[PDB]
Curated annotation (Swiss-Prot):
InterPro entries: CDO_1 (IPR010300), RmlC-like_jellyroll (IPR014710), RmlC_Cupin_sf (IPR011051). One of its GO terms (molecular function) is zinc ion binding. Its EC number is 1.13.11.20. The lineage of its organism: Eukaryota, Metazoa, Chordata, Craniata, Vertebrata. The gene is Cdo1. Pfam families: CDO_I. The keyword Iron applies. Binds 1 Fe cation per subunit. Ni(2+) and Zn(2+) can be used to a lesser extent. This is Cysteine dioxygenase type 1. Keywords: Dioxygenase, Iron, Metal-binding, Oxidoreductase, Thioether bond. Catalyzes the oxidation of cysteine to cysteine sulfinic acid with addition of molecular dioxygen. Its cofactor is Fe cation; Ni(2+); Zn(2+). It catalyses: L-cysteine + O2 = 3-sulfino-L-alanine + H(+).
Amino acid sequence: TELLKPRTLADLIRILHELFAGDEVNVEEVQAVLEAYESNPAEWALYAKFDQYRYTRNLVDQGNGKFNLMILCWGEGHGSSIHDHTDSHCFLKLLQGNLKETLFDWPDKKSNEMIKKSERTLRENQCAYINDSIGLHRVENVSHTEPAVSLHLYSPPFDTCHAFDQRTGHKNKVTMTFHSKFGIRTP
Ligand SMILES: N[C@@H](CSS)C(=O)O
Ligand SMILES: [Fe+2]
């Protein structure tokens, strides 16, 4: 009920366990708390494990089963597919660098080019929110010189989703994997 500024990543995690103690989710409250945590690189260095060729997903907390909290690491020019979020809430907070978020509408069943609804540049410490009822999105680090690090919370947890072909709107099921869990590389 009473939202306080998270002092550290650990404190944020404790607050998040409180916010997800029940069966529902106050989206605006979760977003405010995520936004209020000041990114401190020393606190999340353990999870910030990059790969040269694509972005990595690094599990931080399993939220007592109610959410997955993870850190995504985007090399220069690394980006995602256009994807949905499997009927889950999805929060994205920038911890380092910038990411471009492009929004798309759910495709009609006819094969057509997916045209962008809009785009925005998410900046350090800002927290965005998406869910399937809002639409689909692609997230990209368009920087040539700066890696980006983001903190993502999904509730309920999911490890599969759909990728959408921008040319047709065709979807394919994708299994998402973790690069690391609790700071441990999981090959
Ligand atoms: N949801 C994507 C990243 S963009 S929110 C993922 O979890 O891989
Ligand atoms: Fe996403």
